[PDB]
């Protein structure tokens, strides 16, 4: 367009930039004021966030949630400072909040799971359905809980494993607790031959469970016929013992059951099979 | 830019701060008024929440929902106080509500599952499909319910387990109740040899179930041939008894069935097999 | 700041509170008017909700949906009541509606599933794919429906078990009705030895079902060779009978099949397999 | 506050209500006119909904979608009436529209599945991938379709079952149509001994399938060795027949195969095992 | 209220309707003009939708998307028509746009999957990963594709089945194409006795695959020992052939393998089993 | 209404249309201007989209993402053009943007999956975890990658199969790469009789793996007893070789292992069984 | 319409374009100013994003999150510039922000998961549940972690595999760490004959584990009878050793157990089976 796209417009057109010097000075002053407002807002936001966190901690509020609200307050104040600065810039204060809301929505979509994990961790720590050192199962993975972080928990399996579970999945599934009740129940299933004397087996098992000191005598001690298996008669034995002695009692009772069953002549049956013959 | 970025602008420029002292005093007064508004709003919010909770508790409303809505009222009032305080400050009253809405959306995304669990727990307590001490199954985990908390239920398995289930998953799945009906039905599957006399087996089982005092005689007592198994004829026996006697009746009936079947000469068959010889 | 933070500002500054007496009186009048508006709105909302529920119930509308929409009307009217009250207070009427909007969104985040269950209950009660008293299957659980509550369905398993299913899950999955069609079909699979005479077996099975009075002769009665099993020839028998006689007909036909097969010399084959011998 | 909360403000203060008699009359007139507007809006909404449904039914539009959108227009008109009435009362129409939007959002969250089922039912009826009377499978459940309702389909399994499937789930999964194609293919798997003559077996099967009049001779008829099984040589036989004769042809061909193989000396092999002996 | 609810207000109060006749005439004129505007908008929307559809179809655009966005334009234009008409009625257009938005949101929640099905159909038709007559697998169901409709795809299984699959699910899962490559590979697993000569078996299989004309000699033809099975040595044979000859080559090669293995004395082993005697 | 619905209103009422000729001309001019604006906006949108696509392609931006932003810019510009045109028509510019927003929301609900697939494809191209010609597994389906299109990826399975997978699914699941490392590990499980000499077996396996030139001697070569099986002692052999020689090394080592095990007298055991005899 | 659609309107109508020359010049000036604003905004956005990233990197902020926030600021500033330019051209500044919000919503739906992957990757690096070179399990896939990229992780399975896992799935599932604890536990299951001497077996196993120097003697070393198997007495042996020696200890202990069990005469039992003879 002849001279419209040349020095008549670029390089300030010689005198066009000079004639607009006052406008440039005003814009520079506005930008400087906006930057100063930004700096002041950041400083006051950090100060007020620290102050409110300290105040909340004093009022018996948990550290994690107090930090969460302190960070939320800090983010709100810095967003307010950005609103004020861009209003001083003159961007209608509406597109500014729209852009900030879009950015916050993107950040929320990014976090979602992490924030849910944080909330679940807060709930876990304040209800404490399980605590450090307590043996519990967490939805298919069982072990001793070491500690509960803000986003995840660390638990040690009996074999020395280290397992980290996000806190969000913890509250969604079941919380299988092994070490809450001081007393728990063992269950033995014993297979005997079909010709074995039921009364003798019951009496022997009753003697075995009677001779154990770690079995709670004041609770139920079930020794009864359970079901007629395909190749073996199955007896069910249920006894109660302290959670600490649960495993040892199981092994001791099983070893004894084996020993007296061998001595008494009661036979543990191999898989029975019945064969009929024809010639061809 | 020469002297624009030096003491001519920083350190109050000597007299610029002196001239702006009036505006600084006005802003300080505004900030003090806003802080006083925040304090009085927090105090009145706490008082109003306590008052409304106390009032509605008397109106036969459940404690959990009353506390929840009292907390909602308190949060609403503190948000309103923040709106008023920042309007006094001059943060356009629209960016403030937008940022508060974004924070509330983040908090809602955080809670989601937990707050749904709270709603579910409210539903369970007043409908009471199950209650403390009642033996129920909650989708693969069965035990005695101990208590129904606001977010979760603690239930004890028959073996001494302590099970914690979030309330939200409870209502989503089936509620399998064992102890609501005072009378329940047992089922026995008895395998006998193919050459066994059907009439004799049926008559013996009928005698066995006739002599049991804990079996309800006024209800159906089926002793019928069920299906021709691969290696055994299977009879089905169904009897009804009070829920407290179910297991004892099952065990006693099975043990008797074994005794009279042994005495009558009816044989429980091992896995049957027919073998044909070929020489190679 | 010298005396700015002392009695010159606190305790009403002596005369500052006195000079502000008119504004405090005006604010007290505003608060009293707002509270009176709240009370009037609550009472009128309750009256209007009761009136509309009573009116629409008479117009052949279901009780559950009528109660739901009456509660919705009551909540709406109290929402307008709070809007008007806080406008009287002077809370800009926009932050107010934003606050109740966030509260309603949180309430929805509570509901989802339970409100869906209520809607599903409405659909079930109005379409009645099943009705109380009949035997149905609702996605893996079978039993007799006892009643259909507004949130859940109570059904009794054939063994006396009490089963509670949320209404929402029922409509999402299949609804199998065992008792809708008055006539149903049994299916027998009979395994016979490979050397058995096919014509004799078919003729005997035809005789057995011909003499059953509870089998519908006007419908198809298939007795045909179904498949050549690994160890047995399998015959399929399909007969139709009234739903009330299905199990009894099944049991009687099976017992007869066994009796005449024993008499006719037709042998039910045990698991067949032949062995080739080598010495090593 | 002395006499602020006494007869001086309650019970119309003697003359305060009288001085406000004109304002009370104006409010009463406003309420009466608002109720009249509501009644007029309701009646005109009903008239317009009926008129539009009648008009669109004539224009070859399906009844279900026409009724749905007529109800939508009815709800829109009553919503407009509520807006007009509540705004003319002076509620600013903004809280009014927000409350109605929240109620509509709650209703939509409640429906969701039901409305999706209605849309799916419309799609199924207008595309008719299956039609009432034909035998089809809908994702694991097979039977004859009885009818397609607006919300769900009733379908009868071959054994007399009555199964109701929500329309939404139907369109999400596969629609397996057993009866669309008039001709279908049977498949036989025949196990014969390893020493059996392959040519003789193939020739016998070819004779068997050649003599069947219901087998389409113009289509492929494969009789070929399929795979060398663990204990048997497996032949695959594939023939085509009209969908009405599919089952009968299967049974007839299987029975003829058994009869000819018995006569021809070809042996169906029992499960094979090879045994090596050692003494210990 | 004395005479407030009598002929003094109902039945037009005699002269009140006479006085308001002018307003009634104005309202009637407004309603008539609004209805005329609705009619004009509807007809012009239909015309514009048809015109834009035709013009864009002329511009090499697919018919499905053309009809879709033409319907979108029609719905948009009728939406503007409703906005204009209801604004001329005096409904402020804000409640109008909110109600129409709520209706559109409900319609979208209804459609959702169906509209996704249309988009998936468009993607499949324009990318054509498969086409009519091409034998493919779409996630567990395999067959010859017949046609691809806008919402669902119809395909015929090899046995005469008719399969209808929504387009949305097809694109979400794997699309396994069976006939895109003109050449494909067969795999044979041959079990032989442990004492069989490996070199003889390998040489015989090599001759068998050498004597087949339909096996591509220019591609890999592996005949190697694959793994030492429990009872049999398993050889793997992999050959390549044209997709049209894949099945026939498999059957021919298997039948030959059987014939020359019988001729050469190489034995296909039955499940070998080892037995030790002890007397008891 | 007498003559209100007749020629006095229709057919322009004779002179009513004539008296409004200027207004009709103004409306026609407005419509013509709006259509011209639409045409100009479409042309300029296409031009600017082409220009920006070319510029981004020149600025080392990937072709797919450049095309995506070009299409986004074109759609945005045509949206602004429609806004301006309907503002010229006079449709309040707010209902217009609401209608376009609803249309865009519907289009987004339609695409959703496709747009996610496009983004996943862009990520897959730019990080290239796999590349054309490289053999990988992508969640249960393995084969050689042919190409990665914008919406989906194509793969050839080792048997010549054709698989097309959406890109969105690829990034969601694991990307299992077979051909990244130049060296990979084989694993042999060898079952031997319980009486076999462990030292002899280990020495023979070591001799076998030493003589293989394609086995990397600089890496670990594990030959150790792994576990005591039910019927066989299982040795584990792990060797490393270049990815190109993996299968050939496996086959050669297995065949040798068989040969020297036969030569040395070490026996591969058949399934062992212990039988105890009793007479009945 | 006569001459309305001809040169009187097109080609600038001769003088109509000339009369509007000033308006065209003003529009061209506005467009040039808008383009200059766009260029300046892009330049300043790039400069600010480069500066802020460098600024926060110095403040001990992670590189990934710093780059993410820098990109967010750049996109925000370019959006602000677009708002300013489209305000200058005169598009009401409202439809502009609506279109940009729709585009951002589409982009968010596109990335959605990928952005969540970036957030998960940021979470992983700071808490480092696993680190490069550390052998861990990622929910069904186990291997040595090579590196943690921003969207995915590369991990090498023990057999030379290359495994790529999206970061999002990592944080959602369990994280099992095999190499965090320096000491881990072994578990041996040893099956012995029923007649074997329990004390002898226990003493021999204890002697085996006492003689291993790599087994931690200060931790539990359980050698107890575990359960009575179908055909074998099963002993459980649990020992603890350093993670580096786990597999070697396992192999050595197993080989010894075999050797001294062979020497001591203790027999590993083959699958026992019980056979009863009958003649037919």
Residue numbers in the entry:
A (entry chain B), B (entry chain C), C (entry chain D), D (entry chain E), E (entry chain F), F (entry chain G), ...: 1 to 280
Paper text:
To determine an open-state structure of wild-type (wt) MscS in conditions that resemble a membrane, we purified the channel and reconstituted it into nanodiscs (NDs) consisting of myristoyl-phosphatidylcholine PC14:1 lipids and MSP1 E3D1 scaffold proteins, which we then imaged using single-particle cryo-EM. The resolution of the map is 3.1 Å; density signals can be discerned and traced for most of the polypeptide chain, except for residues 1–15 at the N-terminus, for which sidechain assignments required using flexible fitting. It is at the junction between TM3a and TM3b where the ion permeation pathway is narrowest in this structure; however, at this point, the pore diameter is ~13 Å, which is sufficient to permit flow of hydrated cations. Specifically, the TM1–TM2 hairpin tilts approximately by 40° toward the bilayer midplane upon channel opening; in turn, this reorientation permits TM3a to alter its angle relative to TM3b and to retract away from the pore axis, thereby widening the ion permeation pathway. This drastic change in the TM1–TM2 hairpin, which is symmetrically replicated in all protomers, translates into a marked reduction in the hydrophobic width of the channel (i.e. the length of the transmembrane span along the bilayer perpendicular). The open-state map, however, seems to reflect a greater heterogeneity in the protein conformation and does not permit a conclusive assignment of individual lipid molecules to specific sites on the protein surface. Nonetheless, a series of densities atop the C-terminus of TM2, filling in small fenestrations formed on the extracellular face of the channel, appear to replicate some of the lipid-interaction sites we had previously detected in the closed state, which we termed ‘hook’ lipids.
MscS resides in the inner membrane of E. coli and greatly increases its open-state probability under moderate membrane tensions (5.5 mN/m in liposome patches [Kung et al., 2010; Haswell et al., 2011]), thereby permitting passive diffusion of both ions and water. All available MscS structures, obtained through either X-ray crystallography or cryo-electron microscopy, show that this channel is a homoheptamer, featuring a transmembrane domain and a cytosolic domain. In the transmembrane domain, so-called helix TM3a from each protomer lines a central pore that serves as the ion conduction pathway, flanked by helices TM1 and TM2, which face the lipid bilayer. Specifically, in each protomer, the TM1–TM2 hairpin changes tilt relative to both TM3a and to the membrane plane, and in turn, results in widening or narrowing of the central pore.
